[PDB]
C-alpha cells in the first residue's frame, strides 16, 4: 500500500510551508477523494527539508487524519500551524 513518509516542517515567520494540495472532493459513493501534494515550491521550507514529494498522499497532519476529509479541512489544518507541523504521507513505487 506504499511506504510511509514522515517529516516535521518548521515554518519561518512570514512564509508558507512550500507545497500545494489537491483533492478532498466528494465522490459519488459519498467519500471524499484523497488529498495529494500537487507541487512543491523550489527553495521553500518543504523543498529544503526534502522528504516530501509531489504525488504523495497525505495521511495525517499532527494527530488528525486526512483520509475522507474535504479539501477545505486539509487547507485549514495546514494554515492553522504557525511553527512545527508533522506531515505523514504515503508514497507508492
Amino acid at each position: 500500500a506504499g511506504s510511509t513518509i514522515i517529516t516535521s516542517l518548521q515554518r519561518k515567520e512570514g512564509h508558507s510551508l512550500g507545497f500545494s494540495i489537491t483533492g478532498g472532493f466528494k465522490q459519488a459513493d459519498g467519500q471524499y477523494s484523497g488529498i495529494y501534494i500537487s507541487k512543491i515550491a523550489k527553495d521553500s521550507i518543504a523543498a529544503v527539508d526534502g522528504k516530501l514529494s509531489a504525488g504523495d498522499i497525505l495521511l495525517k497532519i499532527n494527530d488528525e487524519s486526512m483520509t475522507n476529509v474535504p479539501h477545505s479541512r486539509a487547507v485549514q489544518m495546514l494554515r492553522s500551524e504557525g511553527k512545527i507541523i508533522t506531515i505523514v504521507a504515503s508514497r507508492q513505487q
Binding site: 489537491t22 487547507v75 494554515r79
Partner: peptide, 5 residues
C-alpha cells in the same frame, strides 16, 4: 481546486 500552503 489546488491550494498553496
Amino acid at each position: 481546486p489546488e491550494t498553496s500552503v
